[PDB]
Design a protein around this ligand. Structure first.
Ligand code: CA
Length: 346
């Protein structure tokens, strides 16, 4: 399968929260993972609050998934030690908590140590950069940083430095990533990423790599911009790894000012459409760009954000249907899959 075609991880995000996508109950999905991939990311169940049951640590469900991975030919990318969304904040992660910095330290120390030897790499900090598209409380930018509870408590970006230092100390063997989205656009957020990463390097922080989520559309951003954004980050260091962490590809572009090039019906791309053929070329060109600009020995992996289209968080988005992944609703490989094959094989 796909993983055989590369010497770096070829991964997939897996569900484990019930319903049709749940990896524990879907033999068809288990079989695809074993055949095609050699790494998993937990789509949800390694987020911060999932490390607790009541006020105590609880690793039962995440341990089950990590063990399944080890039994089925998969390494694990941990997602994520620090992330801002309120739905997954531990209850300690509050401006009302006087003990915040101590509880933060305990979180990273405990979780990273717990998974030592079982989890190859981590998203240590995820989504620390400001994004207007993603500022529902209207807090605004602090010179490009998101003013999450971590930022507010620490009075600035030092929480990022600390998270990386503690993760390194707790599990020296793990590859430590900074992960974010829209950083492939080669715009304002890419520049903020350069600032963020350069500051960490200047501070001697043990960051091993940068993750690009790569939640893209078929025709935006341009491949030239994606390529240059990755190049900018590769240029910051002789050793920093690059990982594509959450790749998926929307046929529909809501935001292009054209409502006549939208597929509005689920049947539009059920069998064949221009969009599935472009999606093949899109997966192909992105994987090719990764290979071209990320040196051998600095390739941390390529992961797609789910197995089959109906599992995707973008199966519906903006009240429109989409088909973002490598396998369709009947779990058959799509042209997208072949695009990855062709890129990885040269
Ligand atoms: Ca459109």
């Amino acid at each position: 399968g796909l993983a055989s075609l590369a010497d770096f991880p070829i991964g997939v995000a897996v569900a484990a929260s019930g319903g049709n996508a749940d990896i524990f109950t879907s033999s068809a999905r288990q079989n695809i993972v074993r055949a095609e991939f050699n790494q998993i990311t937990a789509e949800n169940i390694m987020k911060m609050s999932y490390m607790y049951s009541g006020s105590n640590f609880s690793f039962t469900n995440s341990d089950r998934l990590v063990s399944w991975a080890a039994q089925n030919g998969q390494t694990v990318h941990g997602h994520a030690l620090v992330w801002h969304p309120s739905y997954q904040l531990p209850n300690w992660a509050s401006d009302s908590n006087a003990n915040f910095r101590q509880d933060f330290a305990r979180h990273i120390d405990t979780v990273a140590a717990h998974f030592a030897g079982q989890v190859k790499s981590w998203d240590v900090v995820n989504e620390a950069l400001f994004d207007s598209a993603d500022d529902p409380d209207g807090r605004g930018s602090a010179n490009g940083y998101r003013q999450s509870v971590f930022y507010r408590q620490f009075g600035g970006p030092e929480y990022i430095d600390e998270a990386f230092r503690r993760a390194r100390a707790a599990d020296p063997t793990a590859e430590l990533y900074y992960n974010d989205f829209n950083t492939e656009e080669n715009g304002a957020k890419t520049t903020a990423l350069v600032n963020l990463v350069q500051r960490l390097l200047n501070n001697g922080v043990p960051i091993d790599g940068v993750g690009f989520q790569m939640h893209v559309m078929n025709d935006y951003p341009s491949i030239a911009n994606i390529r240059q954004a990755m190049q900018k980050i590769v240029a910051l260091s002789p050793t920093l790894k690059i990982k594509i962490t959450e790749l998926d590809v929307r046929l529909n572009n809501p935001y292009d000012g054209n409502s006549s090039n939208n597929y509005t019906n689920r049947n539009d791309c059920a069998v064949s459409c221009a969009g599935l053929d472009r999606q093949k070329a899109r997966y192909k060109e992105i994987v090719q760009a990764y290979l071209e600009v990320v040196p051998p020995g600095r390739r941390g992996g390529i992961t797609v954000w789910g197995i089959a289209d109906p599992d995707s968080w973008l199966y519906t988005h903006q009240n429109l249907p989409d088909w973002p992944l490598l396998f369709n609703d009947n779990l058959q490989p799509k042209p997208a899959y072949q695009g990855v094959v062709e890129a990885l094989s040269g």
